[PDB]
Amino acid sequence: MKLSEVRKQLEEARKLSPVELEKLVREKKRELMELRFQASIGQLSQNHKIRDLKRQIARLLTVLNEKRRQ
RNA sequence: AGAUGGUAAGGGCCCACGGUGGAUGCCUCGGCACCCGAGCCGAUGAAGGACGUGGCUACCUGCGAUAAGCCAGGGGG
Ligand SMILES: [Mg+2]
Ligand SMILES: [Mg+2]
Ligand SMILES: [Mg+2]
Ligand SMILES: [Mg+2]
Ligand SMILES: [Mg+2]
Ligand SMILES: [Mg+2]
Ligand SMILES: [Mg+2]
Ligand SMILES: [Mg+2]
Ligand SMILES: [Mg+2]
Ligand SMILES: [Mg+2]
Ligand SMILES: [Mg+2]
Ligand SMILES: [Mg+2]
Numbered sequence: 001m002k003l004s005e006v007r008k009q010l011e012e013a014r015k016l017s018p019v020e021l022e023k024l025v026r027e028k029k030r031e032l033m034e035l036r037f038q039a040s041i042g043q044l045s046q047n048h049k050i051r052d053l054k055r056q057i058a059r060l061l062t063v064l065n066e067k068r069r070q
Numbered sequence: 071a072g073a074u075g076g077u078a079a080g081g082g083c084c085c086a087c088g089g090u091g092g093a094u095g096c097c098u099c100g101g102c103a104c105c106c107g108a109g110c111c112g113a114u115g116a117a118g119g120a121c122g123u124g125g126c127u128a129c130c131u132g133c134g135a136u137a138a139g140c141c142a143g144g145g146g147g
Contacts, residue, residue: 036125047126050124051124054136058139061140062140
C-alpha cells in the first residue's frame with residue numbers, strides 16, 4: 001500500500017466509530033481469507049496484497065483500540 | 071682347464087613430480103585483562119521458555135492471531 005493511501009486509511013478510520021471499525025475489520029478479515037484461498041491454488045500473482053491487508057487490519061484494530069482506550 | 075660379465079620376482083639409497091595430510095606464516099568476525107561508565111527486573115505477570123508468525127520458509131533473527139510487525143514523536147536523506 002502507498003504511504004499516502006496509508007495516511008488516507010488512518011484519517012478515514014479515525015473518523016469512524018468503534019462499531020463501524022469492527023464492521024470493517026470483519027470485512028477485511030473476510031477479504032484476506034479469499035486472498036488466502038486464492039494464494040493456495042496458485043491464483044494470486046499479486047501476493048503483496050496479503051501483507052497489505054494484514055496491516056490494514058492491524059491499523060484498524062490499532063485505531064479501534066485508540067478509540068476505546070479512554 | 072681357467073677366468074669374468076648381461077638376469078631383478080622383488081628390495082635398498084638418491085633425484086624429480088604428484089597424492090594424502092593440515093604444520094607454518096600472514097589474517098581476524100572472536101576472546102582476555104584492566105580502567106571508566108552504568109546498575110535492579112517482577113501480579114500493569116518478570117527471568118526464562120513453548121507453540122506460532124513470510125505469497126513460496128529448514129534454520130537463525132525479529133515479532134505475537136494487529137505476529138520480520140500497528141500508532142505517534144524525534145532522528146536521518
Ligand atoms: Mg506502516
Ligand atoms: Mg651372472
Ligand atoms: Mg632392480
Ligand atoms: Mg616388476
Ligand atoms: Mg640394502
Ligand atoms: Mg605435494
Ligand atoms: Mg604479526
Ligand atoms: Mg543491569
Ligand atoms: Mg519473556
Ligand atoms: Mg521464531
Ligand atoms: Mg516513527
Ligand atoms: Mg518520521
